[PDB]
Amino acid sequence: VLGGGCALLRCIPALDSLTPANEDQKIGIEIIKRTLKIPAMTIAKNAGVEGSLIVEKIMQSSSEVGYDAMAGDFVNMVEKGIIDPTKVVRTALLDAAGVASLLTTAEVVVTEIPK
Amino acid sequence: VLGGGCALLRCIPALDSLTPANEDQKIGIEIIKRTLKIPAMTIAKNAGVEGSLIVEKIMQSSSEVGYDAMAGDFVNMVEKGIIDPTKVVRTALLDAAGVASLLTTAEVVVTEIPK
Ligand SMILES: Nc1ncnc2c1ncn2[C@@H]1O[C@H](COP(=O)(O)OP(=O)(O)OP(=O)(O)O)[C@@H](O)[C@H]1O
Numbered sequence: 001v002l003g004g005g006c007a008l009l010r011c012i013p014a015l016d017s018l019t020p021a022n023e024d025q026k027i028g029i030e031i032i033k034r035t036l037k038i039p040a041m042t043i044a045k046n047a048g049v050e051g052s053l054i055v056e057k058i059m060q061s062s063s064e065v066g067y068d069a070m071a072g073d074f075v076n077m078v079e080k081g082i083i084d085p086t087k088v089v090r091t092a093l094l095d096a097a098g099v100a101s102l103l104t105t106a107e108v109v110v111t112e113i114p115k
Numbered sequence: 116v117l118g119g120g121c122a123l124l125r126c127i128p129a130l131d132s133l134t135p136a137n138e139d140q141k142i143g144i145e146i147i148k149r150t151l152k153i154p155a156m157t158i159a160k161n162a163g164v165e166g167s168l169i170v171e172k173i174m175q176s177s178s179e180v181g182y183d184a185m186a187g188d189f190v191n192m193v194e195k196g197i198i199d200p201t202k203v204v205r206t207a208l209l210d211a212a213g214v215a216s217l218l219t220t221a222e223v224v225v226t227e228i229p230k
């Protein structure tokens with residue numbers, strides 16, 4: 001798939017085409033929708049530029065256009081070779097979500113008293 | 116002038132039409148140029164939205180269009196009444212710059228030892 005976090009950026013309208021069952025499911029869908037911009041934002045922030053403007057410029061562009069943080073330019077990602085494995089992206093997303101959504105269900109935390 | 120920090124936002128091409136004498140003057144001009152977006156960003160950030168995207172949408176718009184953070188939408192701001200005194204804007208800019216650029220010239224700081 002496309003590299004630079006653009007592959008997760010192109011799946012936001014798939015979440016926009018979802019009908020939640022209730023308000024809490026809608027909250028979770030919005031959480032994932034806001035999370036989907038995080039890798040591209042982090043890559044752009046590590047390059048010294050403002051990641052939100054870069055992310056908005058990526059979503060306002062065509063589906064083949066992403067941000068090259070090395071050259072700092074908006075390019076064709078397949079033609080420039082900036083590509084990612086699909087397995088890596090889905091594995092990272094699923095493994096992050098499964099533990100973080102379970103962590104957010106907590107009300108009580110029990111720890112050992114430090115000796 | 117226009118309110119919402121847009122009056123300082125419309126003076127950025129006036130800085131783009133400047134020729135610095137050396138590199139340090141260029142650094143100072145860039146400092147003021149980056150500072151000119153700060154009040155609109157702060158107003159948008161206090162409203163719960165991302166201020167950088169709002170600022171970019173303001174500069175991509177016409178000269179009469181700004182952001183109403185009360186209604187959260189982009190409007191003709193003379194017609195909507197969001198206006199500022201010119202004296203207040205220039206007083207704030209000059210009073211901030213005069214002390215802050217002198218503060219940034221410091222190399223040594225001498226303080227009294229706390230008793
Ligand atoms: N020139 C580039 N422009 C834009 N994005 C790029 C560029 N080169 C790599 N990337 C992106 O940066 C990410 C790679 O980051 P990095 O390899 O440091 O971390 P990771 O793969 O998440 O984890 P790990 O630390 O295990 O390697 C991928 O999303 C890749 O598509």
Ligand SMILES: Nc1ncnc2c1ncn2[C@@H]1O[C@H](COP(=O)(O)OP(=O)(O)OP(=O)(O)O)[C@@H](O)[C@H]1O
Pocket residue numbers: 117118119120154158182183184185186197198199
């Ligand atoms: N509805 C609005 N939409 C957008 N900007 C607005 C709106 N109402 C006011 N503003 C802007 O917000 C700023 C006013 O902020 P505020 O009065 O809290 O601070 P100040 O004038 O800098 O200082 P002081 O605390 O001394 O009043 C002005 O720039 C004004 O144009």
